[PDB]
Amino acid sequence: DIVLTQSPATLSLSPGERATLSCMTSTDIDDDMNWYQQKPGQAPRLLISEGNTLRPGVPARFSGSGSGTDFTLTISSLEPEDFAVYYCLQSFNVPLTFGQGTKVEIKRTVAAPSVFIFPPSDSQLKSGTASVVCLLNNFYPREAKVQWKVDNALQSGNSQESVTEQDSKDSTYSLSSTLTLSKADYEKHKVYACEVTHQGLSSPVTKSFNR
């Protein structure tokens, strides 16, 4: 009871376009719906409060509608400042519950990632651990797959990924995939390779090294 379901998970839109965000509640909440915006490294910012009320200082392109269990946040014309994450919140009853958030990202032309591979440093090897870094740089859309092959043998469960926020300058994403092996294991194998799969790639791209 009192579950808030936001939709969609990601809005891919261009500046100037209209944004429609959905937030569904499991029970009537007496129109006590609230909307929040949050930019990276900042506290959330209240846009709309109970009864679909526009907060002071918030532009008119922001508006809130809905009734009962169905509520909508509409951004009439997207600005570059408006691309961010948006949370809904009900304030009808405890426990106060938030929506899971919708990210409104910039839609741009598809761009394949530049793929780089980084062997462990001579420095790091001396420490007893070995990290191999795969780098996927400046791509769109966000979806990408990385698989590690050590001497052609596929690796699983020994890698970790990280993705940057959408670039403010070029609206692309970058990704890192880090393979962690012991110093001993690293020197018991010859070929290290990562395979990348992405929309902008007609074929999977593999970058590798030896010694």
């Binding site: 006590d32 929040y36 959330p44 209240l46 990290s131 740089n137 400046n138 993705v163 940057t164 880090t178």
Partner: protein, 214 residues
Amino acid sequence: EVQLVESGGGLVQPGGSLRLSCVTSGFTFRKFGMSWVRQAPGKGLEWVASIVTGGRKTYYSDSVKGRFTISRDNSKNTLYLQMNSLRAEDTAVYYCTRGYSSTSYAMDYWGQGTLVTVSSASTKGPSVFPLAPGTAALGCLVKDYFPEPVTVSWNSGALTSGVHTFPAVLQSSGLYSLSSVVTVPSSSLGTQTYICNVNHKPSNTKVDKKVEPK
């Protein structure tokens, strides 16, 4: 001018305790309901607890009920969150928040936010390793530090364009790792200098690694 200043966050071990304090200014404190909201890294907003204008009533999320106590002293314009029996999943930026109206707990003003890290790991500075390189890529591996955050700059901040510093990732050892990368001209590689500046305040460590080709 409205202000919600927080303190009392920081490191703490499982089972340990903390008291978050939020001192408010710019508005009549007693006239408002207050709440705490947290946000685990990479995750969304989660309500922790609310308190009425006075001290009479309190409400807690299922996640913290019985472990946390919210409270306010109107004479000090201060909000408190007593956090006992802390768990790893309590790790979050906790926000001191103010209700916008007298009958709702919907937040309009948010505190600056303080990171609360619940972990058994000890404070440790990062080991910084070079990621050796018409465009070549290079960067620094910022491995095995605790806790967050670290700051990474290149050439003392002179180089910003093309730099990507990835969000940290918690490793099974309890330590964090990230990488900061930048793309540069291949022709400039033996002439231009590339140095990553890694600062980790909690461990009082600063590291400068020069990144050159193999």
